[PDB]
Structure 1
């Protein structure tokens, strides 16, 4: 279905503030800031595989929409949460006080993570 795709990053806002506050070693931060990572999605109805790639940081995630799951975050840290389908195209979850919205509009996925007052937004494009 609906999200399924290779995508790769185009633009992003506020990488830095965000990745600070989340608990990142500022070393591999500024390496990170200008990497354009690639997202593989497989959607089978309500079941998702998310494969993010930055370097040979593979993190690989899966969830079923509506049910509990365990997501590896950008830290390595693994968190129990639920991803929900508010639309047929926008995936919403909260982990560690981050609001994560993931939106497909056509061939562009937009991801907005939000930790307090910081808005970390990633625009990616289909390949």
Structure 2
């Protein structure tokens, strides 16, 4: 597999506001981040992925995982946990209580679909990134 390899840049976020509300991000912070454009850098070698995300102020998040094996996950908030990612129909999926993330290439583009659950219900964010 090589489909995911390269450098990607956010071009659209659909469902951004409802998703952010559901997960408890306050209003002024939502507005402060609607036009933020994330750069994602991916190195894929078979089942091994290195997944790098560039944030403001030289802040970087790198994830490293093998499909189907328990891996160490890392977060922008500086948190850590363990998870297991499947590869199903070209789609990378992590799934657990209250949260699902899928990432695929559709129409030559990196498409990240997140689904979070809460007391308000469920919200979906679709983030699309173009190749740079």
Match of 1:67 among 52, 69, 72: 69
Distance (whole Å) between structure 1 residues aligned to residue 46 and residue 88 of structure 2: 14
Runs of at least 5 residues in structure 1 that lack an aligned partner in the other structure: none
- Give the alignment's TM-score, normalised by structure 1: 0.86
For the aligned residue pairs, the C-alpha RMSD in angstroms reads: 1.9
| Larger Cα-atom Rg | 2
Q: CA deviation at 1:106?
A: 4.9
Q: CA deviation at 1:28?
A: 4.1
SS where residue 77 of structure 2 aligns?
coil
Distance 1:110 1:50, change over 3 A: same
8 Å Cα contact 2:68-2:86 kept in structure 1 = yes
Alignment of 1:1-127 (within 5 A): 1-24=2-25, 28-56=29-57, 57-87=59-89, 89-95=90-96, 97-116=98-117, 117-127=122-132
Mean alpha-carbon deviation: is it higher for 69-78 or for 52-61?
A: 69-78
Give the ranges of 4+ consecutive aligned residues of structure 1 lying more than 6 Å apart after TM superposition. none
Number of paired residues? Answer: 126
Runs of at least 5 residues in structure 2 that lack an aligned partner in the other structure: none
- Give the alignment's TM-score, normalised by structure 2: 0.83
